[PDB]
Amino acid sequence: ADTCYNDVALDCGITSNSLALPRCNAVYGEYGSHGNVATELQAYAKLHLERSYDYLLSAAYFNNYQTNRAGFSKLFKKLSDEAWSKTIDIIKHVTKRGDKMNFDQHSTMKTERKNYTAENHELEALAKALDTQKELAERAFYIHREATRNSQHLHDPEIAQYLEEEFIEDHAEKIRTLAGHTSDLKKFITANNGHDLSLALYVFDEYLQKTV
Amino acid sequence: ADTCYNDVALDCGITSNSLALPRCNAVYGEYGSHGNVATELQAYAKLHLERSYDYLLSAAYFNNYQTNRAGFSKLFKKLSDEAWSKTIDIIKHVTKRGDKMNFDQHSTMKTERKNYTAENHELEALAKALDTQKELAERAFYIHREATRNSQHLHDPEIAQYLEEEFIEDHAEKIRTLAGHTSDLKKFITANNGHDLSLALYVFDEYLQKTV
Amino acid sequence: ADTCYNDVALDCGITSNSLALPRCNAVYGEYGSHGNVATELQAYAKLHLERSYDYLLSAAYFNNYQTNRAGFSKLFKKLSDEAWSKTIDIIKHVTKRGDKMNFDQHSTMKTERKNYTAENHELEALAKALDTQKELAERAFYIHREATRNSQHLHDPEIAQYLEEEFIEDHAEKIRTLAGHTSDLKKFITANNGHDLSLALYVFDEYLQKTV
Amino acid sequence: TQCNVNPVQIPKDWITMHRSCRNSMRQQIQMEVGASLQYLAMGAHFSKDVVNRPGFAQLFFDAASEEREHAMKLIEYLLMRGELTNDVSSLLQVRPPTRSSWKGGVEALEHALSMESDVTKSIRNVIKACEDDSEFNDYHLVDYLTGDFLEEQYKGQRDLAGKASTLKKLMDRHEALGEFIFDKKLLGIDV
Amino acid sequence: PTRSSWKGGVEALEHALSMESDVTKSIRNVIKACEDDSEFNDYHLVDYLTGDFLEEQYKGQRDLAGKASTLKKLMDRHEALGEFIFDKKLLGIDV
Amino acid sequence: PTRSSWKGGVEALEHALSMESDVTKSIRNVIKACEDDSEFNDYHLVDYLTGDFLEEQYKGQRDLAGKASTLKKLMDRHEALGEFIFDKKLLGIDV
Ligand SMILES: [Ca+2]
Ligand SMILES: [Ca+2]
Ligand SMILES: [Fe+3]
Ligand SMILES: [Fe+3]
Structure with missing residues (x-):
């Protein structure tokens, strides 16, 4: 059983000439070692990041002079701000658990590919x-x-x-x-x-x- | 993969003469499609509703002039008010998740049948x-x-x-x-x-x- | 199906000469009957109790005149106080669920045996x-x-x-x-x-x- | 690798406690911890659903925390005098308490009174060891144990003795109602 | 006074600790004289010296000893910056 | 993004300074395009980019450049302690 304390005892010995301390990190419960939870959490930050900007573009579209729907624009701006805030929160959680964020991590969850278009009529946008x-x-x-x-x-x-x-x-x-x-x-x-x-x-x- | 957006694209076409939009509801995670969770939640609102009135009758019984136990009556009145409030909260949760409340829904959980009687001595009532x-x-x-x-x-x-x-x-x-x-x-x-x-x-x- | 109400009906009969009421306790969901959850919770209170005193000794060590690290001492004192408080909270939870605390209960979780020593240099203590x-x-x-x-x-x-x-x-x-x-x-x-x-x-x- | 700083030495003439006194203090620290653990078990007992005496439970959980504070005060005294630069790990040992059940509130109060009485006698023995060492009469520690620790002990014993007398008088004919009312009074509740 | 110069803060703190240690020993000797006089045990003065004067002495010694240990650890490689920072901390200034 | 790791605070501050420097140059190019179009000099947008965006850019560059200079001076002999203290100062904490 490797522990941070044992790593210190070994590396802080006069025999050693380094201080790696591989077990002195915030990883516990084998986070990141088994399953896909660690990589899925990283991909979840990425999904929120992408959606924050999709929502921002919808907010912009509804604020052009022809559409001019301040209520719809406000709805999307709030969704964008919340998704941006969650992106940062998830990144911080990933590092809190001893992992590191990878912005190119993909999810294993089989999700169809459908481009997000910002130019929509009201019902389409809400849908x-x-x-x-x-x-x-x-x-x-x-x-x-x-x-x-x-x-x-x-x-x-x-x-x-x-x-x-x-x-x-x-x-x-x-x-x-x-x-x-x-x-x-x-x-x-x-x-x-x-x-x-x-x-x-x-x-x-x-x-x-x-x-x- | 049916989505609300795709339903809108199809129904809002000049070819269509209706607007069903079956996927534009609050159902996600296949709530109500697999298992008994959706029907059990409805039956749980029903159980709280029935118990709210059972407790109300116990509160009344302990407030008759012969028993006259204001403390026991208050205990049951609180249980009744809480169960009534939970009944409404569960009904709202059922609809929040895109389902509809059915007041005749039964639970699958095998529970014995024992009528609730309000006329009891103190120990019996607490039991x-x-x-x-x-x-x-x-x-x-x-x-x-x-x-x-x-x-x-x-x-x-x-x-x-x-x-x-x-x-x-x-x-x-x-x-x-x-x-x-x-x-x-x-x-x-x-x-x-x-x-x-x-x-x-x-x-x-x-x-x-x-x-x- | 044994219930507290049925125990009362039986024992409060003129035929009876006792009032055992075995089902009139706070046990539900078969807490303590299947699995190791009940005993593990008791052993968890014991682990917090032991660690509270280990941390207290580290706090003392860092407050001796040679080490004199008020910050390290404060860190350990806080860990000690929190573990002491959790010990009492877990004991109360064990009894809330109808069980009784046993201070000699052991955990089944296979955990290596490593004595806690309070005399350590700063890195060792944090590790x-x-x-x-x-x-x-x-x-x-x-x-x-x-x-x-x-x-x-x-x-x-x-x-x-x-x-x-x-x-x-x-x-x-x-x-x-x-x-x-x-x-x-x-x-x-x-x-x-x-x-x-x-x-x-x-x-x-x-x-x-x-x-x- | 060098993970720590080479120790330094400063004057040590100010460090004056003698061995017999220091060893008696170390033993007292373990005794206070043992008392805290025994009080935790009393708190746990009265917290049970089938006992249900929340007033007694709180009384004993409070006593457990107070004994832990007593242990900490003795440790702080040794640290102030320049001790515990080593031999800290061996100061304490957490072990299951000897008793875990009591027939009722009176038995628990009488057991607590007896535990306090034992602690008082033990503190008086630490005082004797610290005062009568032929090579060094530790005036200050003797004074501290007498004015702080014994003060708390005598007041505590009188409090427990009074509680035991009051409740015990109710036991020959009012065991259940007497203890129920007394228990709520411990919580400051007049029924 | 006998001394008027010190090499640095550590020497002064150690000298102060030694002065306090001497005062503590002297007060304990006053206590002995006042308590053990065969003709009159001065209970009240002994109590006053023990509870007031010795109390201040022991707390003071521990404070000086801790300051000396903390600063002395900085002397082998950080004599100037270590003492500078420690000195400002004495004024309640965190640089 | 193209980069995901930095050796230390200095490398990150220098990279940020370079990114800001690139943005400043790009904004100046937007200004040129908007001002010099032979068919329409967009006075208002040029003014907006100059008075709002460039203002933020120049202040930001000076701030990052100063931070980089201050921290970099500590790197030849105090890489760990220097960065630790500087990092806490960014949080408004004077150790
Ligand atoms: Ca769960
Ligand atoms: Ca939860
Ligand atoms: Fe919560
Ligand atoms: Fe005590």
């Missing part, structure tokens, strides 16, 4: 926001399962509790909110032959300005 | 309260296991964390408190041939008025 | 603190796994959430902090042939006084 938030949420479910269930030799409840507290609880609220927005728009489009659509989009945008 | 709280607690353990362990294709840590935070932590405190009350009454009944029983029940009820 | 905190953290991972994964008939998310909230989250921070301290000392020892070591230890101790 894409809903899909991307569900993807972030299901990725957290995947990492959580990898940490506490998929590998016989890996059990990391620290990562599980971190995901539960910092990601999982709030994902449900965001997804429910976005799903509700798509239902509202769907009704504006279909009821009474969609006759109130333009006034409804204006009223809905004003509502977002007050509630986002 | 029944203890048993019903243990049943609520074990039902939470069951749903938690169904969400994260029993089904290979179902892993829902959102439901697990919700149960951990809103139900599981507090159940231990309530059960320990009620178990302690039954121990106190047991001693009043058995020590010194139960000679101090009537004075002890009065003193104990006054104690409940100050601590419930 | 030992790091190792003992990793051991406390991995023991929590072990109990957590025993409660929710290792035994088919045992599922206790109350113990799991208790460990997640009261131990697991904070262990990561403490271990990362201690690992960082060993890295700093390692650099003081190796850079520029270790020429700044004595001044660096003084500066580092002053830093600990301000940040512990």
Whole structure:
């Protein structure tokens, strides 16, 4: 059983001429040794980073003079700021557990390839926001399962509790909110032959300005 | 892979004459598709609803002029109010996750059938309260296991964390408190041939008025 | 199905001459009946108790007139006080769940035997603190796994959430902090042939006084 | 590799405790720790669901923490006098306490009174060793043990003795209700 | 006074520690004289010297001994910077 | 990003200074393109880039250059302690 104390005893001996101390790091519970939890967490920071900029572009698009939807723009700006903040938080968690961030790490979770386009009408934009938030949420479910269930030799409840507290609880609220927005728009489009659509989009945008 | 965005692209096409958008809802992690977690959560709201009214009847019984135990009545009124509040909270969680509440949903957990009677002497009433709280607690353990362990294709840590935070932590405190009350009454009944029983029940009820 | 209510009905009968009430306790979810979770929790209180006094001796050693490192002493005193407080908290949790504390209970987790010595130079002391905190953290991972994964008939998310909230989250921070301290000392020892070591230890101790 | 700094030496004439006194202090430190562990076991016992005396549980958990503080004060005294530059690891040993169950509050209070009585006698013996060493009468430590430690001991014994007398009078006919009320009074609750 | 110069802070701290050590021994001798006079054990003065004067002496010695140990460790390679920083810390200044 | 590791604080500060220097040059080129287009001199954007963006660039470069100079002087003999102290000063902590 290698320990940091034993590494010190060995290397601090007059016989030694170095001080490697490989066990004197923050790694415990074999974090990073078994399973894919460590690499998946790095890829999760990368997903938040990419989405933060996708949301930023949507916020910009809704703030052009033709669309001019301050409420939709505010909704996306908030999603962007939150994803940017989470990117930094995950990077710090990766290093807190004794690993190092690799910005080119890929996830093993088989996820289809669909480019994010910022130029969308209101319903399309909310639908894409809903899909991307569900993807972030299901990725957290995947990492959580990898940490506490998929590998016989890996059990990391620290990562599980971190995901539960910092990601999982709030994902449900965001997804429910976005799903509700798509239902509202769907009704504006279909009821009474969609006759109130333009006034409804204006009223809905004003509502977002007050509630986002 | 069906997504809300793809449903919108298809239905918003000039070719379409409807807007179903089946994937534009709050369902993710296949909630409700595999396992019994979704139906068990609905049955859990139903159990709290039924118990809220059982506790309310016990609170009423202890407030009749013959029993007149304000402390016991307050204990049951608090249990009733908490169970009523939890009923609404669970219903809201069921809908937050994209499902719909069904008030006739039954649990699969094999639980014996024992009618709740409100007319009881003090020890009997506390014993029944203890048993019903243990049943609520074990039902939470069951749903938690169904969400994260029993089904290979179902892993829902959102439901697990919700149960951990809103139900599981507090159940231990309530059960320990009620178990302690039954121990106190047991001693009043058995020590010194139960000679101090009537004075002890009065003193104990006054104690409940100050601590419930 | 034995219940506290049924025990009362039986024992409170004119036929009875006793009041055992074996089911009127705080035990639920078969806590203590299957698996090793109950005994492991007792052994965990014992580990914290032993470590609280080991840390106390290190705090004393660093406060002797020759070492006179107030920062190192404060670091160990805090670790000691926290472990003492956790010892009492775990004992209370053991009894809250209807069990009783046994101070001679051993853990099944195969852990090597290494006496804790308080007389150490700074790097050695931090290395030992790091190792003992990793051991406390991995023991929590072990109990957590025993409660929710290792035994088919045992599922206790109350113990799991208790460990997640009261131990697991904070262990990561403490271990990362201690690992960082060993890295700093390692650099003081190796850079520029270790020429700044004595001044660096003084500066580092002053830093600990301000940040512990 | 050189991981530590070559030690330095400063004047040592100020370090004056003698062996017999120092050894008695080391033994007292272990005794205080042993008392803290025995009080933890009392706190654990009264915390059980089938005993359920939270007032007694808190009383004894508080006593356990206080005994730990007593051990720390004795250790700090030795450090102030220039001791414990070595032989620190052997100062203490944590072991399971001898007793883990009591019939009721009276038995626990009487056991606590007896434990305190033993500690008082032991401190008086440390005082004797420190004062009567033919080569060095340690005036200051004797004064510290007498004015601080014995003061706490005598007040504590009187407090426990009074609690035991008061509760024991209730045992011949009011074991359950008497202990229940007394227990809540320990929590500052007048039923 | 007998001495008017010191090589550095360590020499002065060690000299102060030795002076305090001498005072402690002298107070213990006053206590002995006052307590052991066969005709009159001066209980009150002995108590005053023990509880007030010796208390200040032992705390003071430990403080000086710690300061001397801390600074002396810096002398083999950091005499100037070590003493400079230590000196400002005495003024409550963290550079 | 192209780089993911640095030998120490000095290398990172020098890399940051070089990155900022590249950004300053790039902004000056945006200014040239916007000001010298024969069909339209964009007075307002040129002014915005000059008064806001370049202002931040020059102050930032001077700050990084000073940090690099200060820390680099400590590297020939005090690599570990020098960087440790400098690092805590960045957090506003005077050891
Ligand atoms: Ca879990
Ligand atoms: Ca949790
Ligand atoms: Fe929480
Ligand atoms: Fe004591």
